[PDB]
Amino acid sequence: MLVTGLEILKKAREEGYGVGAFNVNNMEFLQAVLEAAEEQRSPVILALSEGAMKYGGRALTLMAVELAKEARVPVAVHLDHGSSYESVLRALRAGFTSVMIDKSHEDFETNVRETRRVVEAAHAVGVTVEAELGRLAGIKDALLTNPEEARIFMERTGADYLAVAIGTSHGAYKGKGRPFIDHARLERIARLVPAPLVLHGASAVPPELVERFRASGGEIGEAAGIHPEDIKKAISLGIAKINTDTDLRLAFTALIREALNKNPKEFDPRKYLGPAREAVKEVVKSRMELFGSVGRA
């Protein structure tokens, strides 16, 4: 069933588990995410970036929303990283039930004002919103989320869930080796901010996947993602929404590569896109196992 992001995230934090927000850009990623959710009888969030918005267009948003209503598990359709008020309006227009306005690279007052404006529009149409305080960077101090400012930010904006900067970042190159997650800071934030918390750039980028990618011909540096244990503890401390994108992309590209390397003569797209879709699905299922959302529907 299609529900708001908060209905899912509030329940999650209260019950101590995490729900995955998986980015999708077309039909098979969307199918993999939803089937994984159905097989795990687990709530899920379909994340569509502004990029997915441009690439997938009406077809993608039509799928995300309508297929969500038919899902037998709770599903929310989330705008990931809305960069403006107008971008958010188009998500509201496309039937999304959750939207993120990212202005963390702006100063406090601007971030507050921009986010508050989004909150009012969204709340007027029953959509819940995610905002971000702090800049997702490698490794109070630095520009990692400040606990007291998080409380203030949330009270002033009225946002529904907060993305926090506690050590993560986007990409396949999180850090050289196991990236450090400020779990102490997470707890302080959680103590003052009762809203469910959000973790961006949380892909695992497991070594075997990077390995399977290189073997198919892919080329990538010394990639590395957040450690499973860090994610498990982050969740226990308040993280209710974990974003995953990179992992899905690697698995998908890998399988496509193996298929084309091995079968010259294959030009039926279902033959190489199908197994790539399956792999994405398996990853989503693992992630749900990790987040503890299995049987949570």
Q: Which residues are annotated as a binding site for dihydroxyacetone phosphate?
A: 171, 201-203, 243-246
Alpha helices by DSSP H, 40-107 = 50-70, 85-93
Distance of alpha carbon 163 from alpha carbon 199, whole angstroms: 6
Q: What, of Na ion, a second copy, Co ion, none, does residue 236 touch, CB below 5 to 8 Å by kind?
A: none
Q: What, of Na ion, a second copy, Co ion, none, does residue 162 touch, CB below 5 to 8 Å by kind?
A: none
SS3 of 253, please?
Answer: helix
Binding letters toward a second copy, positions 29-68, x by CB under 8 A: xxx-------------------x---xxxxxx-xx--xx-
Q: What, of a second copy, Co ion, Na ion, none, does residue 194 touch, CB below 5 to 8 Å by kind?
A: none
List the binding residues for Zn(2+).
Answer: 81, 102, 132, 170, 200
Q: Is 80 a catalytic residue?
A: yes
Contact status: 103 vs Co ion (CB under 5 A): no
Tokens standing for 208? 């075997």
Distance of alpha carbon 230 from alpha carbon 38, whole angstroms: 26
Q: Which of 17, 30, 16 is nearest to 289 (CA)?
A: 17
Contact status: 229 vs a second copy (CB under 8 A): no
Tokens standing for 141? 């101090």
Tokens standing for 89? 């309006």
Of 5-13, 55-63, 73-81, 272-280, the window that binds Na ion (rule: CB under 5 A) is 73-81
Contact status: 217 vs a second copy (CB under 8 A): yes
Q: Which is nearer to a second copy, 54 or 176 (CB)?
A: 54
Contact status: 28 vs Na ion (CB under 5 A): no
* Contacts with 60 (C-beta within 8 Å, 6 or more apart), sequence order: 24, 25, 26, 30, 48, 52, 53
Contact status: 160 vs Na ion (CB under 5 A): no
CA geometry: angle 195, 283, 220, nearest 5 deg: 100
Binding letters toward a second copy, positions 147-186, x by CB under 8 A: -------------------------x--------------
Contact status: 174 vs Co ion (CB under 5 A): no
Q: Work out how close the CB of 260 gets to Co ion at its nearest, in angstroms, rounded to a whole number.
A: 26
57 burial class (0-12, 13-18, 19+ CB within 10 angstroms)? exposed
Q: Are strands 197-199 and 161-164 parallel, antiparallel or unpaired?
A: parallel
CA geometry: angle 113, 20, 62, nearest 5 deg: 75
Q: Which is nearer to Na ion, 161 or 213 (CB)?
A: 161
Residues in contact with a second copy by the rule CB under 8 A: 25-31, 51, 55-60, 62-63, 66-67, 70, 172, 213, 217-220, 249-250, 252-254, 256-257, 260, 264-270, 273-274
